[PDB]
Every structure is written in structure tokens, then in C-alpha cells.
Design a protein around this nucleic acid. Sequence first.
DNA 1: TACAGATCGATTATGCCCCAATAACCACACTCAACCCATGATGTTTTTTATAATGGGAGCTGTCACGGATGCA
Length: 49
Amino acid sequence: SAAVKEFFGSSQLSQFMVQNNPLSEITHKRRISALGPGGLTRERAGFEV
DNA sequence: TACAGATCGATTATGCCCCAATAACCACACTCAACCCATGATGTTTTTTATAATGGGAGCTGTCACGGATGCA
């Protein structure tokens, strides 16, 4: 339960869901990110990615 | 006959003993703290356990790319 709770809420890929519009809802749930565990960082990422 | 005054008798002044309050000054007091010294309940620390136990890595870290030294071999 500790590990699953840390992933659900304390991880980078789980963040508060935007609720301004239904469009914001859809475009936040249909989102692809290249960060988080095993991914790049904004400082590290160059140009090709 | 015309014209005068003259004493009874009234409002006004000026001062003070009392005195019905005025204020300071001095006398005695109860209640409420303050600190202390216990009794004891709670708290904190120390000591010992005898079948046998004999080498983790803890999660790596996930990957940019310059320059300038730098310590070698």
C-alpha cells in the first residue's frame, strides 16, 4: 500500500487534473509526456527529442 | 384765610456665628496571592536474556555537452 500510494500522488506523472473546460479534461487525459522515471529532463533534453 | 415743618414708619445698606456641608490627613482590617515542603504518582534509565544464528551491496544511475585543467604511463 505504501508503494502504490507513493506512485499515486507523489510521482511526477500523476498531477492535479485541469478542470477549466471539458476540452482541458480531454487534452490532459490524452497527454503524452517524455519525463518522469526513466525519461528525460528539461535541462538534459537537447534538440533531436 | 394760604403756605411751611414734624414724628410714626417703612425699605436699604454692612458685617458675622453658625453651620451644613466641604476636603484632606490619619487610624485599623480581611481577602487574596506567593512561595515552600512535603506524598506520591508518573516518568525515565539501566541491566539482562545461554539452541543456534558469521560478508549488503538496494537501488543504483538511465545516460547533455561544453571547455579547462589534470594526473599520469
